[PDB]
Write an enzyme that holds these catalytic residues in place. Sequence first.
Site, PDB file in Angstrom:
ATOM      1  CG  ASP A  53      20.104 -69.346 191.275  1.00 58.84           C
ATOM      2  OD1 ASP A  53      19.159 -69.986 190.778  1.00 58.84           O
ATOM      3  OD2 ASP A  53      20.836 -68.604 190.587  1.00 58.84           O
TER       4      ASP A  53
ATOM      5  CD  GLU B 145      18.941 -73.474 189.788  1.00 59.25           C
ATOM      6  OE1 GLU B 145      20.041 -72.915 189.930  1.00 59.25           O
ATOM      7  OE2 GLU B 145      18.681 -74.175 188.783  1.00 59.25           O
TER       8      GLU B 145
ATOM      9  CG  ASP C  64      14.169 -66.970 186.624  1.00 59.97           C
ATOM     10  OD1 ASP C  64      14.249 -65.724 186.709  1.00 59.97           O
ATOM     11  OD2 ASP C  64      15.009 -67.741 187.129  1.00 59.97           O
TER      12      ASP C  64
END
Length: 523
Positions: free
Chosen positions: A320, A367, A420
């Site tokens: 991430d 990401e 998310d």
Amino acid sequence: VPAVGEDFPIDYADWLPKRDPNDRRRAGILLHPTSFPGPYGIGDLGPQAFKFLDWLHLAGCSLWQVLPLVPPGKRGNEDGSPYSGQDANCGNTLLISLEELVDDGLLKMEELPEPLPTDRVNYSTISEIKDPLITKAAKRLLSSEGELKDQLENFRRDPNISSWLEDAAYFAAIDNSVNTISWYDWPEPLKNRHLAALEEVYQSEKDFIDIFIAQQFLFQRQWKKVRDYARSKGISIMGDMPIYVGYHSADVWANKKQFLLNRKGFPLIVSGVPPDAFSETGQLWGSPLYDWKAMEKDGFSWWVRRIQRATDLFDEFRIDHFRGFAGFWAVPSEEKIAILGRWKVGPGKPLFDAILQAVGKINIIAEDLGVITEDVVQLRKSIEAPGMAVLQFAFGSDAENPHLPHNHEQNQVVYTGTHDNDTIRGWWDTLPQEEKSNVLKYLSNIEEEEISRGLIEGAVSSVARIAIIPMQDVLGLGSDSRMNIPATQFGNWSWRIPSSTSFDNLDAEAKKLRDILATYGRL
Ligand SMILES: [Ca+2]
């Protein structure tokens, strides 16, 4: 080949174009194990994990994506968040299956609780119920003298394991005993890891430390069983790691010089992102930042070990905020908002070179959502890491939107949405009419009633080599099943597959997915 103009061998026409196995088209399901159904208040690495993998195999999927498996912080309103972990390397002991422990003889059936409410993980009560049982099992293992004891000993003594586990266990023991908000306020001999003080800790907190290590062994063993079963079914497991780690952790306390701290161990600057024309104020994450200059000097040893552990758990994994490796936003630690900060130069490709040299080849997924800069794209491309496409982000701008299928590339991972995002159905329900019109037009003028099928097929038919669908969308679920809302502090990470839904009753859903995987060459 021979000289220009000369004869090739007689068998020349048999030299057909090669298909690199790394380029195989695959499909996967996003499902965090806490979401598995069952009677003990939270999903676990037990019977349901195997039933899930059987269903995935039946559906023709060759990948399973999970969120980070670390112990979530419980010290605020980050309730149950896989992304606010207490340690970068440990496994979440709440994922340990009570039933598998009964099979091992470490728990008695009579000790297991009566069935708990099944709809949702209650993070406020689950630890109080499960922790004592996991502790009981760990104690039984410690006092045992058979095969499992031997395995516990080999685990504890493994140089890769011990490189993080010893620090993690001592950190937790000290945290338990001292009980300040952070190690910054620990008594100096413990804060600064005086050799004699640590020796004293193991003498006074022996049981705590032994039990902590035993619990991590129990996690390791259950996870290995799941991973081995997955592999037996042709399923890889894709994990996830935040780029940064939390201040109050063994990761920082036992490796202070890896981070930008002052002489008293307080962060000089912390993580966040700057405003990008949103609400005037940006985002203050507040994690300590890596001393990347210092790290380069030892061949990025700390990051190498972090990756080693990630590969011990996962076949491949996303990182991430991958953009942080190219450039990262740094906020002076005194500041209460992200406004005042600067972009700093990240480590770049040399980090990945060192990882390659030490660990070998890994499928790291970058990401790369939100506003990113050109250096981030060049870094990603330079290590041949796939980025992401998320279909729920594709339809609200223009035809140059990188999330639209005609803009995908082969070395990429496509999602309908992630943990998310809302579910397809939930997203559709709150989507403005203009955007709805645009989606339907793009997807070849399909009916609003088949939006879920339309988005799922849009992902599966993409050129992207990996397509991932959240389990909620397979189940046709709405906003009440959303895993996380990024703006928020409550109600997150708690979705579970309803008690009434079982994997053995999902043959129709598996067939429906398998058929499109066949059509679009992911089978
Ligand atoms: Ca505490």
